[PDB]
Amino acid sequence: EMEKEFEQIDKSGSWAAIYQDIRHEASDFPCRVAKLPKNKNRNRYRDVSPFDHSRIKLHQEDNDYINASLIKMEEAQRSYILTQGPLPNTCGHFWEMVWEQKSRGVVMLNRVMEKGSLKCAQYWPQKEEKEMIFEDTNLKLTLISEDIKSYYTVRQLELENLTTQETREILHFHYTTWPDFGVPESPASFLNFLFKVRESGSLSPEHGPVVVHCSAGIGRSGTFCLADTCLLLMDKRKDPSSVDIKKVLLEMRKFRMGLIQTADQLRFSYLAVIEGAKFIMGDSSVQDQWKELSHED
């Protein structure tokens, strides 16, 4: 199992090598359209692209490209869209994806500024009064409310198709205390956050796939999905032992490159899943322990 494996890797200090095998075994698929000249300003990082086979296509004549991938987890029956943080020129496309993909939730795992640089455009309105309009995609976005907690913030937004005057409620779950290439403060705050997302219905199959992003859409986003999928599988067969994390991760990496960016992010994934297993297997009290230990208020 994973807990025994976790200790075996730990007490030998071999996470770097376990993580490197994963890196070495990971799928390599082509990213032809990401690399087209006409798409250079649509990509935040040169070395982070969506595979053609799993990329999300914008529904438009002109240019249907966005740096976003559908990760479709067959056995788990969960899909996620992983994407880079929007660029000043792709905030319209981003909100277009969300509309067309019928997404209910957006999980943001980074801050707009980290380490003195700009990791993501300010793609949602910070004030109720000052809604945003995306003229290129004919979408309007309004802040309806927010709930600021100590290390994450939840917002309600209303997205309007200005063409059909049709509106939707989107939930924005914003984790504000996770350093790029880092890990969360502890399993508890991460898990408390994950279960907040779940409790919202954002991950439910009656909606389009959740949009998950960090700066690149792979390190912190990969960590989130991996843990979520792993806990889901464990829940579905109520068998902690049947779940092989490394194998789930390799499965996810068929759909987008680079998922989990450091060995420590891998170790943390193990950690989060092992701790989340408690709740899955019938210990309802741990959720309240996570809320306390997270120091939410």
Ligand SMILES: NCc1ccc(NC(=O)C(=O)O)cc1
């Ligand atoms: N080195 C390219 C590169 C740049 C940024 C990232 N960030 C993330 O995955 C993240 O936001 O966690 C990952 C890879």
Ligand SMILES: [Mg+2]
């Ligand atoms: Mg105000």
